[PDB]
Symmetry: C4
Subunit: 355 residues, 4 copies
């Protein structure tokens, strides 16, 4: 609720081309299809082939920033990005070579930041997941077995065996309900009374494990990525030790591109920002073009008013942001700091129109 995320977070065309690239697949998969576009999409594969392949060698030119690096991840796919289609192109002469479009699916995961963020926490909490997965296997066959007890007599063709009932177990337990094979008697139907009761309680825990400290990591990602942009601020030499831990939980940093708007004049003053690198367009008669290490919004928060200037991104700015309460928290935290932001709420009034 407090951030301006811009400049194409889904930026790199390495990621962009997997989506249209794999939709080329399906038309080959269909009978009675004209040969015209049949191969026209195979070009686009060759384009994406040639495109990453064009990009490939530039990546294999890893004499850029060549001091110490760990690029086993970023290279693990680019290699196979072109090899696997190639060997597929010859050995699998039939159209089945296209079935090696299971390969580009990692290219999103190549430059998927937020995917290592996922895999990080699984290596702390899987202790639970296994004991739950076991426990899921307990409840699975603990309950799947009681069905064969009953309808094997009058439903051989559906429940004349165990795994046919273990099939109906997870369908019955995992919220799904296909609707192929269902009991007819009473007591077998009684048993379902505890199943959905169970599995919704189980996954009530099990999937809960994921979001549990995943949020800790994302709420932690907002700190580790933002213990940076701390020393950059000229004013933050007085901040006590325990002060920052209270604060950086809320502070997120994002980048705005050049030409974009930052805060439009007259809209309700609801937030203030800290500039640390870039330049702005504080839209005034004399534009107060503030550079790395600046801020604005106290004019609108101490007064609780609309904006005093159509601030727009003159350049690509690495932005911070902050809503009132946590700044009211700061204004409540120390009288030493409100002195400057009092003067600032008088300097910027005259300094906005003037120079």
């Amino acid at each position: 609720m407090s951030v301006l995320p811009f400049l194409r977070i889904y930026a790199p065309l390495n990621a962009v081309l997997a989506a249209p690239g794999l939709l080329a697949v399906a038309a080959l998969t269909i009978p009675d299809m004209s040969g015209r576009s049949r191969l026209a999409l195979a070009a686009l594969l060759a384009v994406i082939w040639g495109a990453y392949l064009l990009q490939l060698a530039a990546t294999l030119l890893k004499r850029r920033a060549g001091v110490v690096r760990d690029r086993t991840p970023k290279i693990a796919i680019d290699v196979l990005a072109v090899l696997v289609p190639l060997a597929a192109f010859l050995l699998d002469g039939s159209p089945d070579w296209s079935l090696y479009c299971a390969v580009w699916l990692l290219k999103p995961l190549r430059d998927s930041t937020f995917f290592p963020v996922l895999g990080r926490v699984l290596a702390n909490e899987a202790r639970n997941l296994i004991g739950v997965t076991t426990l899921f296997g307990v409840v699975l066959f603990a309950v799947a077995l009681a069905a064969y007890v009953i309808e094997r007599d009058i439903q051989p063709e559906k429940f004349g065996s165990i795994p046919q009932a273990m099939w109906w177990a997870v369908v019955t337990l995992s919220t799904t309900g296909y609707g192929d094979t269902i009991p007819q008697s009473f007591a077998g139907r009684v048993l379902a009374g505890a199943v959905m009761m169970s599995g919704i309680g189980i996954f009530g825990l099990w999937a809960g494990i994921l979001a549990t400290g995943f949020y800790q990591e994302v709420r932690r990602g907002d700190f580790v990525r933002n213990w940076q942009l701390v020393a950059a601020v000229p004013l933050f030499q007085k901040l006590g030790p325990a002060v920052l831990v209270e604060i950086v939980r809320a502070l997120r940093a994002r980048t705005v591109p050049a030409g974009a708007v930052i805060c439009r004049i007259g809209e309700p003053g609801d937030r203030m920002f800290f500039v640390v690198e870039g330049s702005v367009s504080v839209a005034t008669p004399n534009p107060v073009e503030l550079g790395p290490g600046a801020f604005f919004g106290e004019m609108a928060l101490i007064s609780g008013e609309p904006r005093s200037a159509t601030v727009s991104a003159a350049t690509t700015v690495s932005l911070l942001s902050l809503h009132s309460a946590d700044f009211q928290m700061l204004c409540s935290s120390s009288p030493e700091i409100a002195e400057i932001f009092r003067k600032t709420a008088l300097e910027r009034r005259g300094a906005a129109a003037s120079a």
Copy 2:
């Protein structure tokens, strides 16, 4: 658990008429329907047309409060509220003109406060949502493809192509289970063992993103809307800086209308309120009719007793509220404040019956 929300939060008739207005649609959609009520409901459309249209120009009279305003939102629908039926009324001579009842659906969203509250946070956390949405697309075709590997031979008419299996993917992954096309072999049925395991883990995170800091915003909405009603209180000049951040998290403000009851006599004393504007009916022999900037309940909390008066809303009061613990927190927070609320628990005993 601690608030008296009253006076028709779903107040404006601009919102009320969308619901019955769109139920006029369906009777036109049905064969063998008598022409009698067929057009009778078209009137009610013309009523809602004429009604907002009657309301319309009063809104286009925006010389009220005309200093600085941002009403691109509130006007964006009122314009089309009447135009779109109108052009639809003539060009689409057949009854299909009624199909432009997709238009009023924004009129709730016109005066839907809590809808901008939604859209505010999506512009901070969609970074995650995309990486998850990509990741959802990863897992989609990563898993959808393995089905065509198998049953294309003996299920052409169901799994003789890829998207027919991507169809069975999300139905299998997104908790649904329609039950149209399901495997027959073993290993294809083995694969589902991880799917519901996956998607319930995925949406365990993904929908978790929404409620994650959505609650922060709603728990924040309870502050930004209630840093107001702070200076109004005559007693709150002594409150230290860090005191309020502890408190305003819990304090919610709502309005009660005239004639309503506030706290009924003899019910268990469970809460105390702060009046800031309006008037009450403290039901006593001499009604102690307290106005803007008053409170009551300490009589019932310091003693832990039922109510001392059938307080009812003499007028429309902008109410605050507070349960014991957070006031016990206040009574624990400072001895300076319990002095007055000790006297108040003696003044109001005699002042209730007397003047």
Copy 3:
């Protein structure tokens, strides 16, 4: 994880008889049923009728504790508990009179504590629920309408109207997937790609509203019910103001009945209790039978050892409880208190075997 809940929390037989009472219904609902037990269960209704009716007048004897009471709730059903069967017994001469077994269903809700706990919070947060319910209605017909656009031509009998598609909306949106009427074309099937995405995000919020501050109330129920049992403790005159708010969050109170076990000897010392009313059986050669206002477990926690005595409930005791950390929190909180619990860890060593 830290409490001994015993003495039949589902105690009153007023609640017990609704369950078997309503299972008497179904046998009447079935053809080809013998008249033998057909009316035998009607007796059990007459029993439950006569039983509450026997209990009834004792409740209508409300000259017990007749000072100030609010028993509109507890009486609202007992009245109709016997009247509604009675008027049903005569006017509805056919067996349909049994269909007034929709009446006892409130008798659980009569003496359902935890049900007012539910209804308390709905009167603070329904503001959200309506805006979401509206928003649910937005997304409902916003999406339901686009289906009639498509398959009305080739599916009249299923999608030849709007509400037939609004039917398929919530089934498609609310996680269910019956499997009666599903599209055949492409773009109509494309639309489902966002639906489960939506509704699982919606209910990801909407049902989240319930548990959101419901837990606040239950975590609050653990305080309001336990600001009692505070002054009872002879030692708690020194506890500072802000000390208790830290503590009572964790402290739960429950009752154990006479004859039950409290802590068995040799089991791992994992918790300590505060007796406030009742008596125990500290199983020793000289049983140190401690009465109202006592405690035990510091012997096992300061040493981190198994139990020093098979403490069992000599009588019905109103119990408190506490795990180590929060007592380690107390031992960390003040050196003034560990002095006594040091002596206590020496007195009770000799006082256990001796008197």
Copy 4:
């Protein structure tokens, strides 16, 4: 996100053999199966029989550590692990004796730590669960009954009775949607509008009860298991009382086996560890092989750099771990401690290459 869990948490072969042991069952359950492997898997049962039975007496040799123990749990299955197949082997001469493979399903639960962790909290919060379970039974028949009101006339064979509709209740309420028996009229279809609305709100609470303080217990498990490894540290005599409660919430302890890697050189310095028992391989020209009661990572955190050494597990080490923020919290918490970790960031620079 901050722990190295290794050395086969799913270690004991007592647990390993239940999974393959029960998959021996199904082949017997199937007609037209050759007798060759039919009994070959019965051997593997006899193996698992003989295997635990071989393990059995070693467990019944409970003169190891025979001082005070509570092994009613660990023995409750081992006894029946071999007896139940045995009596089954003779009395049930037909192949049905295999149906006593419902017995090993507890053997995972025998040595399932994290299963008592489950059962611990159910004995505090089931108060809620019953009132919800009752309330679930309220809503069940409250809603199930209204269906028989309607379609009994034109759907006898599906809704000609009550429990046939209570069947359609939970299927309709518990998120499932089999798709066997669905209404045809309007008002009966209207009723579903509140059902999924309800049950998703109910289980929104009910399953929420599980994860609610289950996480408290797991977040508590991280303390009770880690108030140990406190006195072992030679430096922690100065830590104030309230300091540790802040810290041990995050600190998890796990064990790494011999031969494994701990932190690889050049990877981004993201965490520091506390050795308390074992030995390491700090890969340097002179390996600084640190033993019980050591730490490392401050070199990479105070500088925010990659690793200074390929530390690998020379032996099985009982590890602790800690990310920066909580150590930055420590560095912010006291200047007394950064003095040593300043010297340590100079000693270990020279002491790494040297001795």
